[PDB]
Amino acid sequence: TVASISSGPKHTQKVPILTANETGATMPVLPSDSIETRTTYMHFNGSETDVECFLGRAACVHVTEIQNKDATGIDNHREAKLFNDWKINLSSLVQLRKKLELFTYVRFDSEYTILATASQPDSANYSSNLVVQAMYVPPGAPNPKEWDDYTWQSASNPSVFFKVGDTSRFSVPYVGLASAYNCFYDGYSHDDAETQYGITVLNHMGSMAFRIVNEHDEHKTLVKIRVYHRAKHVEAWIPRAPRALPYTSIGRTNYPKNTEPVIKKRKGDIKSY
């Protein structure tokens, strides 16, 4: 492939460099339309800018935490982090969010990796070996209530059991209701005067609640869960302007008030170098 062809002096009536940008086109002008060039080859394919590659590496999408401790006398397991759930979503932690929102609709399979590490902040004789059980509580299915409810039987709901310190990995097909996931949605769930606006009403998918299977030892053990997400088989439509201001909320486009100028001011003139 040639990156530049050889081109010499020109004295024409045919001027490729004068255009009318009002038309909305970006005319494909090249170095050889306005200087004299020599042949050179590309030596490159643009492999690593493919959208599959761009969205295809694992990104941290969520960090939560649960603890193993005596539940005796706990009136609210959920509240003691005797377990927790994550109203699944991707636009929470942002590095990946800005990347996805370069597109309007996106379609992909997900590969999740879940790393779990334990901490024992206060005096323990040892490190126990805990098994985590993360399970998929899609929406309509009941929510556990205690860390050892009938829910955890999970007879119809996919669940994975792995050890703290290890990693769990599995992949979920594209579960969207439509043909693509909306990265943006300028609508409502119905014509209500006070209903919420945005994507929080669309990109529904319930949650994934984690717990330790082990009963309690004498000390307490903090287990912190990190969920990583990798898109595989990516398809993206309609590019948009990149995010400039900071984010404030999952699912709304809102930016913070009295934010700071995002364009760097010159130290000098327009004329400055």
């Binding site: 009318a20 940008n21 009002e22 038309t23 909305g24 086109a25 309007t104 609709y105 439509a178 043909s179 693509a180 996931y181 909306n182 990265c183 943006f184 949605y185 300028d186 609508g187 409502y188 769930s189 119905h190 014509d191 209500d192 005067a193 006070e194 209903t195 919420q196 606006y197 945005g198 994507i199 309609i238 590019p239 948009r240 302007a241 990149p242 995010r243 400039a244 201001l245 984010y247 404030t248 909320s249 999952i250 699912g251 709304r252 486009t253 809102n254 930016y255 913070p256 008030k257 995002v262 364009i263």
Partner: protein
Amino acid sequence: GYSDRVQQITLGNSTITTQEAANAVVCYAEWPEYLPDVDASDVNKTSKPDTSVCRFYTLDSKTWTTGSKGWCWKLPDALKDMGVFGQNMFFHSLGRSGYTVHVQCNATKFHSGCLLVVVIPEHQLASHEGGNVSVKYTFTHPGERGIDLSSANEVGGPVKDVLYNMNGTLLGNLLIFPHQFINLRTNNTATIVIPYINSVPIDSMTRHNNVSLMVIPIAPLTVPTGATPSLPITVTIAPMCTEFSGIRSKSIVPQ
């Protein structure tokens, strides 16, 4: 003697002529078309009013003055009240449509000024409150009036800050969306053909707007000496290939 410059668009029972065009944009290089069976889901036969809905509606005019910040209309909202297009809209459960948008602004060879005319698929607005405040329905359904970016923040309304496109992105990059400029010195109209763009084959016309049309002054209007300091901008829009499905009782929407 054909120029890129003169054009005629006849759609239904209405025709537009421009003698100072700058080509026309067809979003994503695709022209509006009906919904193919292979893509269909709802089993209902759809209704295609054709020429009674696919004609040109001219919205009320705006006034560009030296202080203007820009205006924003949503589709199909802007047309919610135009003739039979609008009736069909409130009466069917689902509908689908593409449009021809023609924005008009003429001046003289002594004026200067340049407007950006852009179509943004799925333009989800931001609340000026920050945090996770929502933007109430009425605020994103201004109707033919559209939203005036130089109007004041209101409560439950969107933010109207132009350098941020009403969503946290910079004005400068709106050029990645199908758009055309109106530069008084060149141009006097802008025309964009919009194919139907959605993640579902057909949708509700009232709970979801699928494009915002935005006209934004970028190089300020500058009139000749002792000229009146303003020009009107007119927007005429025509639904094209419209289909309605799931007819019934007639939606009632807030406000």
